Motif scaffolding. Structure first.
Motif, PDB file in Angstrom:
ATOM      1  N   UNK A 160      15.942  43.734  88.018  1.00  0.00           N
ATOM      2  CA  UNK A 160      17.222  43.336  88.657  1.00  0.00           C
ATOM      3  C   UNK A 160      17.292  44.086  89.985  1.00  0.00           C
ATOM      4  N   UNK A 161      17.113  45.403  89.949  1.00  0.00           N
ATOM      5  CA  UNK A 161      17.095  46.227  91.190  1.00  0.00           C
ATOM      6  C   UNK A 161      16.176  45.555  92.218  1.00  0.00           C
ATOM      7  N   UNK A 162      15.011  45.107  91.776  1.00  0.00           N
ATOM      8  CA  UNK A 162      14.045  44.478  92.697  1.00  0.00           C
ATOM      9  C   UNK A 162      14.672  43.245  93.326  1.00  0.00           C
ATOM     10  N   UNK A 163      15.307  42.420  92.501  1.00  0.00           N
ATOM     11  CA  UNK A 163      15.911  41.217  93.037  1.00  0.00           C
ATOM     12  C   UNK A 163      17.037  41.581  94.001  1.00  0.00           C
ATOM     13  N   UNK A 164      17.777  42.645  93.675  1.00  0.00           N
ATOM     14  CA  UNK A 164      18.849  43.092  94.546  1.00  0.00           C
ATOM     15  C   UNK A 164      18.317  43.476  95.930  1.00  0.00           C
ATOM     16  N   UNK A 165      17.190  44.204  95.956  1.00  0.00           N
ATOM     17  CA  UNK A 165      16.474  44.486  97.191  1.00  0.00           C
ATOM     18  C   UNK A 165      15.946  43.228  97.882  1.00  0.00           C
ATOM     19  N   UNK A 166      15.351  42.324  97.109  1.00  0.00           N
ATOM     20  CA  UNK A 166      14.774  41.133  97.704  1.00  0.00           C
ATOM     21  C   UNK A 166      15.820  40.308  98.460  1.00  0.00           C
ATOM     22  N   UNK A 167      17.051  40.284  97.944  1.00  0.00           N
ATOM     23  CA  UNK A 167      18.146  39.596  98.608  1.00  0.00           C
ATOM     24  C   UNK A 167      18.547  40.356  99.870  1.00  0.00           C
ATOM     25  N   UNK A 168      18.680  41.665  99.770  1.00  0.00           N
ATOM     26  CA  UNK A 168      19.120  42.438 100.912  1.00  0.00           C
ATOM     27  C   UNK A 168      18.152  42.406 102.089  1.00  0.00           C
ATOM     28  N   UNK A 169      16.842  42.319 101.824  1.00  0.00           N
ATOM     29  CA  UNK A 169      15.896  42.170 102.919  1.00  0.00           C
ATOM     30  C   UNK A 169      15.971  40.734 103.425  1.00  0.00           C
ATOM     31  N   UNK A 218      27.984  46.057  78.883  1.00  0.00           N
ATOM     32  CA  UNK A 218      29.302  46.646  78.721  1.00  0.00           C
ATOM     33  C   UNK A 218      29.345  48.045  79.338  1.00  0.00           C
ATOM     34  N   UNK A 219      28.279  48.820  79.132  1.00  0.00           N
ATOM     35  CA  UNK A 219      28.212  50.167  79.666  1.00  0.00           C
ATOM     36  C   UNK A 219      27.942  50.229  81.171  1.00  0.00           C
ATOM     37  N   UNK A 220      27.363  49.154  81.736  1.00  0.00           N
ATOM     38  CA  UNK A 220      26.775  49.160  83.077  1.00  0.00           C
ATOM     39  C   UNK A 220      27.537  48.480  84.216  1.00  0.00           C
ATOM     40  N   UNK A 221      28.091  47.290  83.932  1.00  0.00           N
ATOM     41  CA  UNK A 221      28.888  46.552  84.890  1.00  0.00           C
ATOM     42  C   UNK A 221      30.172  47.337  85.146  1.00  0.00           C
ATOM     43  N   UNK A 222      30.868  47.135  86.288  1.00  0.00           N
ATOM     44  CA  UNK A 222      32.091  47.885  86.540  1.00  0.00           C
ATOM     45  C   UNK A 222      33.203  47.414  85.604  1.00  0.00           C
ATOM     46  N   UNK A 223      34.207  48.271  85.377  1.00  0.00           N
ATOM     47  CA  UNK A 223      35.192  48.007  84.342  1.00  0.00           C
ATOM     48  C   UNK A 223      35.924  46.700  84.636  1.00  0.00           C
ATOM     49  N   UNK A 224      36.123  45.899  83.586  1.00  0.00           N
ATOM     50  CA  UNK A 224      36.748  44.594  83.710  1.00  0.00           C
ATOM     51  C   UNK A 224      35.774  43.424  83.842  1.00  0.00           C
ATOM     52  N   UNK A 225      34.503  43.704  84.144  1.00  0.00           N
ATOM     53  CA  UNK A 225      33.578  42.644  84.510  1.00  0.00           C
ATOM     54  C   UNK A 225      33.014  41.903  83.306  1.00  0.00           C
ATOM     55  N   UNK A 226      32.492  40.711  83.580  1.00  0.00           N
ATOM     56  CA  UNK A 226      31.886  39.895  82.521  1.00  0.00           C
ATOM     57  C   UNK A 226      30.413  39.798  82.808  1.00  0.00           C
ATOM     58  N   UNK A 227      29.645  39.241  81.876  1.00  0.00           N
ATOM     59  CA  UNK A 227      28.176  39.135  82.043  1.00  0.00           C
ATOM     60  C   UNK A 227      27.847  38.111  83.139  1.00  0.00           C
ATOM     61  N   UNK A 228      28.865  37.524  83.764  1.00  0.00           N
ATOM     62  CA  UNK A 228      28.649  36.535  84.854  1.00  0.00           C
ATOM     63  C   UNK A 228      28.873  37.238  86.194  1.00  0.00           C
ATOM     64  N   UNK A 229      29.140  38.544  86.166  1.00  0.00           N
ATOM     65  CA  UNK A 229      29.257  39.317  87.428  1.00  0.00           C
ATOM     66  C   UNK A 229      27.951  39.130  88.188  1.00  0.00           C
ATOM     67  N   UNK A 230      28.037  38.965  89.501  1.00  0.00           N
ATOM     68  CA  UNK A 230      26.832  38.671  90.255  1.00  0.00           C
ATOM     69  C   UNK A 230      25.748  39.723  90.007  1.00  0.00           C
ATOM     70  N   UNK A 231      26.142  40.998  89.881  1.00  0.00           N
ATOM     71  CA  UNK A 231      25.202  42.083  89.616  1.00  0.00           C
ATOM     72  C   UNK A 231      24.353  41.873  88.356  1.00  0.00           C
ATOM     73  N   UNK A 232      24.849  41.040  87.442  1.00  0.00           N
ATOM     74  CA  UNK A 232      24.119  40.715  86.197  1.00  0.00           C
ATOM     75  C   UNK A 232      23.577  39.294  86.263  1.00  0.00           C
ATOM     76  N   UNK A 233      24.459  38.320  86.500  1.00  0.00           N
ATOM     77  CA  UNK A 233      24.036  36.896  86.583  1.00  0.00           C
ATOM     78  C   UNK A 233      23.744  36.553  88.037  1.00  0.00           C
ATOM     79  N   UNK A 234      22.499  36.218  88.433  1.00  0.00           N
ATOM     80  CA  UNK A 234      22.204  35.973  89.855  1.00  0.00           C
ATOM     81  C   UNK A 234      22.663  34.583  90.269  1.00  0.00           C
ATOM     82  N   UNK A 235      23.200  33.799  89.337  1.00  0.00           N
ATOM     83  CA  UNK A 235      23.533  32.383  89.632  1.00  0.00           C
ATOM     84  C   UNK A 235      24.682  31.886  88.785  1.00  0.00           C
ATOM     85  N   UNK A 236      25.901  32.340  89.035  1.00  0.00           N
ATOM     86  CA  UNK A 236      27.075  31.797  88.331  1.00  0.00           C
ATOM     87  C   UNK A 236      28.140  31.509  89.360  1.00  0.00           C
TER      88      UNK A 236
END
Lengths: 316, 316
Positions: A160-169, A218-236
């Motif tokens: 995921x980190x890699x994809x996050x970088x790939x988008x930022x470049x 649940x432990x990782x996304x920011x509080x309140x977020x769902x598994x569709x948060x962009x940081x988790x789901x790259x396409x929602x």
């Protein structure tokens, strides 16, 4: 089994008798040495990375750079763990590469996008090093590195980190000349979604379960977020349109029998239809999460290394 | 780094540049298959064990029995973990043995002597199986097992468990004919003490630290106890005199650079002077905890297997 470590140690029960192929002792194995050292890359957060250099080809030619981001669920792991350390030993010697193995902040204490911001700090660190000749103080001797040949290899969370970088470049948001990342390799990428895929509803693996994946999020996304948060789901309903972003060559390697398989294939095939995107998808059959690193001696682990090397050699 | 997983994921920092020897790809490796299945051994606590059988020699001769007890700190781990699963694959094929790989209750929820009582339940389970011909329902086909050739192999916590069993048989407290444990193999035995040894005060390992060892004991011993509790320290104000107990052949394998080294050598040499005790002590130099299983491809891992096999062959 309510806490992460407890749930991890709860265990899985084979419903059925199973068979595995084991490799036996070879008497005249071949040897490489690999040099390794730890350096802080981010002083405020006291984050270390480890650097690896095959001694053999440090005298032969300039070494490409492989930034390895370890797995976990953004919740555990370290470069210093024998599991990951050993993988990097193998990356260094097998790929003939200077390997960079950073730690990043973990959850639930430092929740996303800490890891993502730390991953950037690693690249920035690399930039500082490239423009200051710090590679001479990397080791007692002298390392020759090709900063125009950087590749990002991610396991689970690191994918995921890699994809996050790939988008930022690709979005042109960050640019670090003389450093050029020529390719990404997402191995078992840790993406999520409120909706299950079929594989996610299918059989647990040895260790990964759907409960455990939800617990990570649940432990990782920011509080309140769902598994569709962009940081988790790259396409929602996720801001990244990505149909405009120019992504670099990418390799998606996943296990055939693994829960993340389907979401990772969807990822791959969506990117392939967004055009201008060299995105290969490789599924290893009968394999579960981490096969390449859990079973270092196997035919699959060996093949994964060769594919990544071929991917890297094709971008020179 | 206050919780166990957090502290484990905190990481260690090499003070110095370091070198390691890595084994490369061999093109014509040799193969064995190994059959494996899970069965509940203790229904009230829903504890499973996994059974392993090399398919190759299941047609050749009766298989000795290796009961493998996994590591952790009585606080984590499972048979189903690829780390341990893989080790057992290797035990089965390398030793040509039926391998029994039990889970046991973990702390801080089920504190000592849960594991010790569960370990006994495994042996009792084996007894039931031996006197009822249940080995035919062990796998779809027929397994031939030598219950007069049982050996206990313990890693960290399992090495303590092993010693706990070795005392209980040697004291004549438990007897399970037709099952006879002919030998114990404590690998990195997890013993403790209020007093540090030198090695304990020496350099942290990749992963084990003195803090982490104390944390294990704090979570594991019953409330109020000190690291001199007999369950942790086998030789303090601890009831076991052991000078009267007839212990069976024992093998103590430890890493040269590991924190537990000194306490495990003291253990070995005390037992050697208590007489009537075939106790070998093997120290692998420059090696830390778990070398045999963390680095399955190494010269040391391969050697550990051969030593255990030779120990087992000498008791037939």
């Amino acid at each position: 089994s309510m806490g992460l470590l407890q749930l991890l140690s709860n265990g899985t029960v084979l419903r059925s008798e199973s068979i595995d192929l084991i490799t036996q002792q070879i008497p005249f194995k071949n040897n490489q040495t690999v040099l390794f050292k730890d350096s802080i890359y981010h002083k405020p957060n006291n984050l270390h990375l480890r650097l690896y250099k095959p001694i053999s080809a440090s005298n032969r030619t300039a070494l490409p750079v492989v930034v390895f981001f370890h797995g976990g669920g953004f919740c555990f792991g370290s470069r210093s763990w024998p599991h990951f350390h050993n993988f990097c030993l193998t990356l260094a010697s097998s790929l003939n590469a200077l390997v960079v193995s950073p730690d990043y902040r973990l959850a639930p204490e430092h929740r996303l996008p800490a890891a993502f911001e730390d991953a950037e700090a690693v690249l920035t660190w690399l930039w500082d090093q490239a423009v200051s000749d710090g590679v001479n103080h990397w080791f007692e001797d002298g390392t020759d590195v090709d900063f125009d040949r950087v590749f990002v290899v991610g396991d689970s969370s690191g994918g995921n980190i890699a994809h996050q970088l790939a988008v930022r470049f690709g979005s042109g948001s960050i640019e670090l000349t003389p450093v050029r990342v020529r390719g990404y390799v997402l191995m078992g990428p840790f993406f999520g979604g409120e909706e299950r895929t079929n594989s996610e509803n299918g059989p647990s693996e040895a260790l990964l379960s759907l409960d455990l994946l939800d617990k990570f999020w649940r432990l990782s996304l920011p509080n309140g977020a769902t598994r569709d948060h962009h940081m988790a789901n790259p396409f929602g309903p996720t801001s990244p349109t990505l149909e405009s972003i120019s992504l670099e060559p990418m390799l998606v390697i996943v296990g055939g029998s693994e829960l993340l398989r389907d979401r990772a294939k969807e990822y791959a095939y969506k990117l392939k239809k967004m055009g201008g995107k060299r995105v290969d998808y490789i599924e290893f059959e009968n394999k579960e999460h981490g096969f390449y690193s859990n079973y270092p001696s196997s035919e699959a682990a060996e093949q994964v290394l060769r594919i990544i090397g071929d991917f890297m050699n094709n971008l020179s």
